[PDB]
């Protein structure tokens, strides 16, 4: 019942500030360290520093010397990660996780950080409607940014067969994904199937139903 | 600051097969209070790090004894007795003997399984978006294996190039297969003064291509 549960994907203009969320739960927090480590898209894993909440003591990894703070907040059980003076390298999935003996045995889900002084779009939502086999349907999400989104089925009740794929850039500088999954045909006229896109750069949260297109004329 | 350097994998493992996976540090990790502190992190497409094991050779709680760590000094292994579909990933060593932490760059498991064809489905761009202006037509590949298949898209068929992209997803953790869309973008006009949408797919466990295929405005 450990748990580290982190704040929502960031965007920020070069020269801007961040400042992500590591919730604990489920132990005694003042026992173990936590530490943050980054990874840049396609790439390994970077140690950035941690925090002894039972003191708010700290220890930074030289490149992050003056530029990261971490604190601990103990009425809401919470880490913070502050860095300021963003540059495009900084874009990167931030994790938060905690050590136990020097190991890091749990971690965070990881907050995506854009650095980027491109304008915030929400997307658009359609629906990829269905045509004693297997069914296909979906949802596009068109013409975004930046990334990430997120796009559960039936508010989380529906995972199995679920295919949400990375997203594309295209030519625009928008992206655009498409998440699919396949079905009993038997359950189309019977069973109601929503995906749920979030896209919190643009604080844009769509519940599309999807349904098999009508024949009527 | 130490460096660690993990060893790539040649090929793909087949399931069922064992994998090793090699890490060594620039210096010794074992440490004066006589600890050696190397630790293996599996990475899933899509989530965080988790721990396999620590101190070497310690089994972190709930990972399967197919996990295994041995070595010392600086030469280490990871080993899984019999590859499952989930252990598909990235694998990471860490050493915790001095500051800063370090990890090793990474070793990607793949997992070789038998050909499995796609299953295709072929969608038309929604009203809604055709009120937009724009068109896009998806063609989706469901579960197959290997990764490699050629998607090809006709209007009325003419074959289509430069107005098409596609994305492919992670192996999956329980089949091991791949999965693709491709998306094909026009505008309200172009579409408009054709009929047939086809995505016709060429892949190893198709005896011939497969189309898939719609009319424009038909049931």
């Known amino acids: 019942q450990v748990q580290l549960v982190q704040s929502g994907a960031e965007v920020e203009k070069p020269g801007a500030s961040v400042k992500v969320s590591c919730k604990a739960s489920?132990?005694?927090?003042?026992?173990?360290?936590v530490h943050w480590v980054r990874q840049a898209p396609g790439q390994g894993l970077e140690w950035m520093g941690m925090?002894?909440?039972?003191?708010?003591?700290?220890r930074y990894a030289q490149k992050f010397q003056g530029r990261v703070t971490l604190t601990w907040d103990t009425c809401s059980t919470t880490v913070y990660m502050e860095m300021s003076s963003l540059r495009s390298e900084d874009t990167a999935i931030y994790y938060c996780?905690?050590?136990?003996?020097?190991?890091?045995?749990?971690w965070g889900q990881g907050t995506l950080v854009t650095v980027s002084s491109a304008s915030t779009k929400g997307p658009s939502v359609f629906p990829l409607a269905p045509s004693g086999g297997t069914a296909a349907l979906g949802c596009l999400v068109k013409d975004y940014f930046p990334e990430p989104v997120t796009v559960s089925w039936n508010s989380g009740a529906l995972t199995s067969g679920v295919h949400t794929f990375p997203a594309v850039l295209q030519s625009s500088g928008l992206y655009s994904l498409s998440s699919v999954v396949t079905v009993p045909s038997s359950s189309l006229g019977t069973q109601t199937y929503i995906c749920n896109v979030n896209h919190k750069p643009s604080n844009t949260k769509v519940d599309k139903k999807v349904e098999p297109k009508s024949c009527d004329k | 600051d130490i460096v660690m350097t993990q060893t790539p994998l040649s090929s793909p493992v087949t399931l069922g097969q064992p994998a090793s996976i090699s890490c060594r540090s620039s210096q010794s990790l074992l440490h004066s209070d006589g600890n050696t502190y190397l630790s293996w992190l599996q990475q899933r497409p899509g989530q965080p790090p988790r721990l396999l094991i620590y101190?070497?050779?310690n089994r972190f709680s709930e990972v399967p004894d197919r996990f295994s760590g041995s070595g010392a000094g600086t030469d280490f292994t990871l080993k899984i007795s019999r590859v499952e579909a989930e252990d598909v990933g990235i694998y990471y060593c860490?050493?915790?003997?001095?500051?800063?932490?370090?990890f090793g760059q990474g070793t990607k498991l793949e997992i070789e399984r038998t050909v499995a064809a796609p299953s295709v489905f072929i969608f038309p761009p929604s009203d809604e978006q055709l009120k937009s202006g724009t068109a896009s037509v998806v063609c989706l590949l469901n579960n197959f294996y290997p990764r490699e298949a050629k998607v090809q898209w006709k209007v009325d068929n003419a074959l289509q190039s430069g107005n098409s992209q596609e994305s492919v997803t992670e192996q999956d953790s329980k089949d091991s297969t791949y999965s693709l869309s491709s998306t094909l973008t026009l505008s309200k006009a172009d579409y408009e003064k054709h009929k047939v949408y086809a995505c016709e797919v060429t892949h190893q466990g198709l005896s011939s291509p497969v189309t898939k295929s719609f009319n424009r405005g038909e049931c």
């Open positions: 101190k070497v050779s």
């Open positions: 925090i002894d909440p039972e003191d708010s003591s700290t």
């Open positions: 489920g132990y005694i927090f003042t026992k173990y360290w």
């Open positions: 996780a905690r050590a136990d003996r020097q190991d890091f045995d749990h």
């Open positions: 860490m050493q915790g003997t001095q500051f800063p932490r370090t």
